[PDB]
Amino acid sequence: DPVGAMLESKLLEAEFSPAVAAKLAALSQHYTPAELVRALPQSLANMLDNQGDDIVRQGGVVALVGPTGVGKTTSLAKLAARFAAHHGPEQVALITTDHYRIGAYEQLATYGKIMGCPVKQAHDLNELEQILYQFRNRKLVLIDTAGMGQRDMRLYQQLDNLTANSRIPIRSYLVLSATGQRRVLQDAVNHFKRIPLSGAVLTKLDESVSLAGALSVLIQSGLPLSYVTDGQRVPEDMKVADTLMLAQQALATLD
Amino acid sequence: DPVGAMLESKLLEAEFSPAVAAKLAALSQHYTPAELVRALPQSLANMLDNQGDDIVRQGGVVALVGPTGVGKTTSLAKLAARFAAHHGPEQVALITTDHYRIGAYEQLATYGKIMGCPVKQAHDLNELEQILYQFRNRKLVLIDTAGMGQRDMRLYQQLDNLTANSRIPIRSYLVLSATGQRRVLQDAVNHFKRIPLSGAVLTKLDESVSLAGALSVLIQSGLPLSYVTDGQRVPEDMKVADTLMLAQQALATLD
Ligand SMILES: Nc1nc2c(ncn2[C@@H]2O[C@H](COP(=O)(O)OP(=O)(O)O)[C@@H](O)[C@H]2O)c(=O)[nH]1
Ligand SMILES: Nc1nc2c(ncn2[C@@H]2O[C@H](COP(=O)(O)OP(=O)(O)O)[C@@H](O)[C@H]2O)c(=O)[nH]1
DSSP string computed for B179-191: TB-HHHHHHHHHH
Q: Do B128 and B163 reside in the same domain of the chain? A: yes
Q: How many A from CA of A170 to the centre of ligand 2?
A: 27
A171/A182 Cα distance (integer angstroms): 24
* Residue A250 counted as domain residue: no
Note whether A71 contacts B: Cβ–Cβ < 8 A: yes
A161/A149 Cα distance (integer angstroms): 18
B232 contacts in chain A (CB < 8 Å): 68, 100, 148-149
Of A150, A151, A207, the CB nearest to B184: A207
A245/A247 Cα distance (integer angstroms): 5
Q: What are phi and psi of B161, to 5 degrees?
A: -60, -35
Resolution of the solved structure (Å):
2.4
The half-sphere exposure of A7 on its side-chain side, counting CA atoms within 13 A, is 19
Do B241 and B227 touch, CB atoms closer than 8 A?
A: yes
Pairing verdict, β A238-240 and A225-229: antiparallel
A4/B137 Cα distance (integer angstroms): 68
Residue from A183, A103, A197, A105 nearest A151 by CA: A183
Element (H, E) at B61: strand B60-65
Method: X-ray
Q: Measuring CA to CA, how many Å separate B202 from each of A36, B194, B199?
A: 42, 19, 10
DSSP B230-248: -SS-TTTSEEE--HHHHHH
Do B70 and B203 touch, CB atoms closer than 8 A?
A: yes
User: What is the DSSP code (8-state) at residue B57?
Assistant: H
CB atoms near residue A235 (< 10 Å): 18
Element (H, E) at B229: strand B225-229
CB atoms near residue B237 (< 10 Å): 18
Q: Do B126 and B230 reside in the same domain of the chain? A: yes
Q: Do A114 and A28 reside in the same domain of the chain? A: no
Beta carbons within 8 Å of B220's beta carbon, 6+ residues apart: B17, B19, B20, B186
User: What is the DSSP code (8-state) at residue B254?
Assistant: T
Do B27 and B7 touch, CB atoms closer than 8 A?
A: no
Q: Do B69 and B158 reside in the same domain of the chain? A: yes
Q: Which domain holds residue B36?
A: 2-48
Scanning B86-239, the segments in alpha helix (DSSP H) are 104-115, 125-134, 155-160, 182-192, 212-221
User: What is the DSSP code (8-state) at residue B135?
Assistant: T
For chain B, give the longest Cα–Cα distance.
Answer: 63
Beta carbons within 8 Å of B58's beta carbon, 6+ residues apart: none
Amino acid identity of residue B106, one-letter, is E
Q: Do B165 and B93 reside in the same domain of the chain? A: yes
Note whether A179 contacts B: Cβ–Cβ < 8 A: yes
- Alpha-carbon Rg for chain B in angstroms: 19
Q: In what order do the strands lie in the sheet with B238-240?
A: B119-121, B92-96, B140-144, B60-65, B170-177, B199-203, B225-229, B238-240
DSSP chain A: -HHHHHHHHHHHHTT--HHHHHHHHGGGGTS-HHHHHHHHHHHHHHHH---SSHHHHH-EEEEEE-STTSSHHHHHHHHHHHHHHSS-GGGEEEEE---SSTTHHHHHHHHHHHHT--EEE-SSHHHHHHHHHHTTT-SEEEEEPPP--TT-TTHHHHHHGGGSSTTS-EEEEEEEETTB-HHHHHHHHHHHTTS---EEEEE-TTT-S-SHHHHHHHHHHT--EEEEE-SS-TTTSEEE--HHHHHHHHHTTT-
Q: Do A44 and A65 reside in the same domain of the chain? A: no
For chain A, give the longest Cα–Cα distance.
Answer: 63
Q: Do A44 and A158 reside in the same domain of the chain? A: no
Q: What is the CATH number for B75? A: 3.40.50.300
DSSP B8-54: HHHHHHTT--HHHHHHHHGGGGTS-HHHHHHHHHHHHHHHH---SSH
A106/A114 Cα distance (integer angstroms): 12
Q: Which ligand is nearest to the CA of A201?
A: 1
> How many distinct structural domains can be found in chain B?
2
* Residue B97 counted as domain residue: yes
Residue from A193, A253, A252, A254 nearest A220 by CA: A193
Amino acid identity of residue A12, one-letter, is L
Q: Do A86 and A130 reside in the same domain of the chain? A: yes
Q: Do B35 and B63 reside in the same domain of the chain? A: no
Of A206, A213, A232, the CB nearest to B181: A213
* Residue B108 counted as domain residue: yes
* Residue A22 counted as domain residue: yes
B143/B132 Cα distance (integer angstroms): 10
Note whether A253 contacts B: Cβ–Cβ < 8 A: no
Binding-site annotation, residues of A: 69, 71-74, 101, 204, 206-207, 229, 231-232
